[PDB]
Protein backbone atom coordinates (compact mmCIF):
# COMPACT_ATOMS: atom_id res chain seq x y z
CA UNK A 1 0.00 0.00 0.00
CA UNK A 2 1.05 3.22 -0.98
CA UNK A 3 2.70 5.47 2.17
CA UNK A 4 1.89 8.89 2.34
CA UNK A 5 4.53 10.96 5.31
CA UNK A 6 3.45 14.09 6.51
CA UNK A 7 3.82 16.28 9.70
CA UNK A 8 0.40 17.05 11.37
CA UNK A 9 -1.78 16.36 13.91
CA UNK A 10 -3.77 12.87 13.95
CA UNK A 11 -6.80 14.84 15.45
CA UNK A 12 -6.91 16.91 12.07
CA UNK A 13 -6.58 14.29 9.45
CA UNK A 14 -9.45 13.97 7.26
CA UNK A 15 -10.39 10.32 5.86
CA UNK A 16 -12.19 7.16 6.55
CA UNK A 17 -9.54 5.76 10.07
CA UNK A 18 -7.20 6.83 12.40
CA UNK A 19 -4.94 4.06 13.53
CA UNK A 20 -3.58 4.71 16.88
CA UNK A 21 -1.33 2.67 19.30
CA UNK A 22 -3.49 1.92 22.60
CA UNK A 23 -3.06 -0.96 25.24
CA UNK A 24 -4.89 -4.43 25.36
CA UNK A 25 -7.67 -2.47 27.50
CA UNK A 26 -8.12 0.37 25.16
CA UNK A 27 -8.28 2.71 27.90
CA UNK A 28 -6.64 5.96 26.34
CA UNK A 29 -3.88 7.24 28.37
CA UNK A 30 -2.10 10.37 27.70
CA UNK A 31 -0.12 11.77 24.54
CA UNK A 32 -1.65 11.35 21.51
CA UNK A 33 -4.71 9.14 22.79
CA UNK A 34 -6.25 11.61 24.77
CA UNK A 35 -5.73 14.08 22.24
CA UNK A 36 -7.67 11.86 20.76
CA UNK A 37 -10.36 10.70 23.08
CA UNK A 38 -10.31 15.20 24.13
CA UNK A 39 -11.48 16.22 20.54
CA UNK A 40 -13.37 13.04 19.64
CA UNK A 41 -15.47 13.32 22.75
CA UNK A 42 -16.17 10.94 25.44
CA UNK A 43 -18.48 8.60 22.74
CA UNK A 44 -15.15 7.19 21.70
CA UNK A 45 -14.26 5.88 25.28
CA UNK A 46 -16.86 4.55 25.69
CA UNK A 47 -17.48 2.18 22.81
CA UNK A 48 -14.28 0.61 24.19
CA UNK A 49 -15.44 0.38 27.32
CA UNK A 50 -18.28 -1.77 25.69
CA UNK A 51 -15.93 -3.64 23.59
CA UNK A 52 -13.76 -5.01 26.63
CA UNK A 53 -10.49 -5.97 26.73
CA UNK A 54 -9.04 -7.45 23.96
CA UNK A 55 -5.47 -9.22 23.13
CA UNK A 56 -1.68 -7.86 22.42
CA UNK A 57 -1.20 -8.27 18.22
CA UNK A 58 -5.52 -8.08 17.70
CA UNK A 59 -6.92 -4.30 17.29
CA UNK A 60 -10.33 -2.88 17.84
CA UNK A 61 -12.80 -0.62 15.84
CA UNK A 62 -14.74 1.88 17.14
CA UNK A 63 -16.54 4.98 15.93
CA UNK A 64 -14.52 8.66 15.66
CA UNK A 65 -16.82 10.90 17.43
CA UNK A 66 -16.40 14.59 16.89
CA UNK A 67 -13.25 13.64 14.93
CA UNK A 68 -13.54 14.24 11.31
CA UNK A 69 -13.29 10.38 10.40
CA UNK A 70 -15.38 7.85 10.90
CA UNK A 71 -13.64 5.32 12.94
CA UNK A 72 -10.62 5.07 15.20
CA UNK A 73 -8.54 1.56 14.61
CA UNK A 74 -7.35 0.64 18.44
CA UNK A 75 -4.35 -1.24 17.88
CA UNK A 76 -3.48 -2.88 21.14
CA UNK A 77 0.64 -2.95 20.81
CA UNK A 78 1.49 -3.09 24.87
CA UNK A 79 0.03 -4.93 27.97
CA UNK A 80 2.38 -6.91 29.50
CA UNK A 81 5.48 -8.15 28.07
CA UNK A 82 4.61 -5.76 26.78
CA UNK A 83 6.12 -3.40 23.26
CA UNK A 84 8.01 -6.21 21.23
CA UNK A 85 8.60 -5.27 17.45
CA UNK A 86 6.48 -9.12 16.58
CA UNK A 87 4.21 -7.60 18.78
CA UNK A 88 4.05 -4.38 16.51
CA UNK A 89 3.87 -6.23 13.55
CA UNK A 90 0.84 -7.93 14.94
CA UNK A 91 -0.89 -4.89 15.49
CA UNK A 92 0.04 -3.10 12.38
CA UNK A 93 -1.21 -5.97 10.51
CA UNK A 94 -4.69 -6.44 12.53
CA UNK A 95 -5.12 -2.80 12.02
CA UNK A 96 -4.60 -3.12 8.30
CA UNK A 97 -7.13 -6.16 8.16
CA UNK A 98 -9.55 -4.19 10.00
CA UNK A 99 -9.35 -0.95 7.20
CA UNK A 100 -9.39 -4.19 4.62
CA UNK A 101 -12.88 -5.51 6.38
CA UNK A 102 -14.64 -2.55 6.59
CA UNK A 103 -13.89 -1.19 3.01
CA UNK A 104 -11.98 1.82 4.06
CA UNK A 105 -9.69 3.74 1.29
CA UNK A 106 -7.74 6.55 3.17
CA UNK A 107 -6.55 5.83 6.75
CA UNK A 108 -3.98 7.18 8.79
CA UNK A 109 -1.10 6.14 11.61
CA UNK A 110 0.24 7.62 14.17
CA UNK A 111 3.97 7.79 13.73
CA UNK A 112 6.63 6.75 16.92
CA UNK A 113 4.61 7.56 19.98
CA UNK A 114 3.79 4.26 22.48
CA UNK A 115 4.26 2.78 18.93
CA UNK A 116 8.00 3.05 19.71
CA UNK A 117 8.25 3.42 23.68
CA UNK A 118 11.16 1.10 24.89
CA UNK A 119 12.13 0.22 21.52
CA UNK A 120 15.07 1.55 18.75
CA UNK A 121 12.61 3.68 16.70
CA UNK A 122 13.98 3.45 13.09
CA UNK A 123 13.67 -0.23 13.54
CA UNK A 124 10.02 0.09 14.82
CA UNK A 125 8.94 2.59 11.81
CA UNK A 126 10.36 -0.22 9.21
CA UNK A 127 8.63 -3.07 10.48
CA UNK A 128 4.89 -0.70 10.38
CA UNK A 129 6.21 0.32 6.96
CA UNK A 130 7.22 -3.36 6.05
CA UNK A 131 3.50 -4.10 7.05
CA UNK A 132 1.75 -1.42 5.45
CA UNK A 133 3.64 -2.02 1.97
CA UNK A 134 1.78 -5.67 1.96
CA UNK A 135 -1.70 -4.36 2.57
CA UNK A 136 -4.05 -4.11 -0.30
CA UNK A 137 -3.29 -0.75 -2.87
CA UNK A 138 -7.08 -0.44 -1.88
CA UNK A 139 -6.05 1.07 1.03
CA UNK A 140 -3.87 4.82 1.30
CA UNK A 141 -2.30 4.96 4.46
CA UNK A 142 -1.11 8.44 5.64
CA UNK A 143 1.49 8.88 8.25
CA UNK A 144 1.43 11.34 11.01
CA UNK A 145 4.83 12.84 12.31
CA UNK A 146 4.58 15.35 15.28
CA UNK A 147 8.12 16.74 14.03
CA UNK A 148 8.56 17.79 10.53
CA UNK A 149 12.07 16.19 10.91
CA UNK A 150 11.06 12.94 11.60
CA UNK A 151 8.20 13.48 8.81
CA UNK A 152 11.49 13.86 6.24
CA UNK A 153 13.73 10.83 7.32
CA UNK A 154 11.07 8.10 5.59
CA UNK A 155 10.81 10.38 2.56
CA UNK A 156 15.36 9.79 2.57
CA UNK A 157 15.26 6.17 4.10
CA UNK A 158 13.05 4.90 0.87
CA UNK A 159 15.86 6.73 -1.86
CA UNK A 160 17.80 4.22 -0.48
CA UNK A 161 19.05 0.09 -0.93
CA UNK A 162 17.94 -2.80 -0.37
CA UNK A 163 20.11 -5.89 0.66
Given at each position: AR??????????????????????????????AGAILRKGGPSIQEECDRIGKIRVGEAAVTGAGNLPV??????????????????????????????????????????????????????????????IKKAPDTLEVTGVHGTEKSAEAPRRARLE???
Open positions: IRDVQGDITEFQGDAIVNAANNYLKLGAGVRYVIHAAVLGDEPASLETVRKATKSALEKAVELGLKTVAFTVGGAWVGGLPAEAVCRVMREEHHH
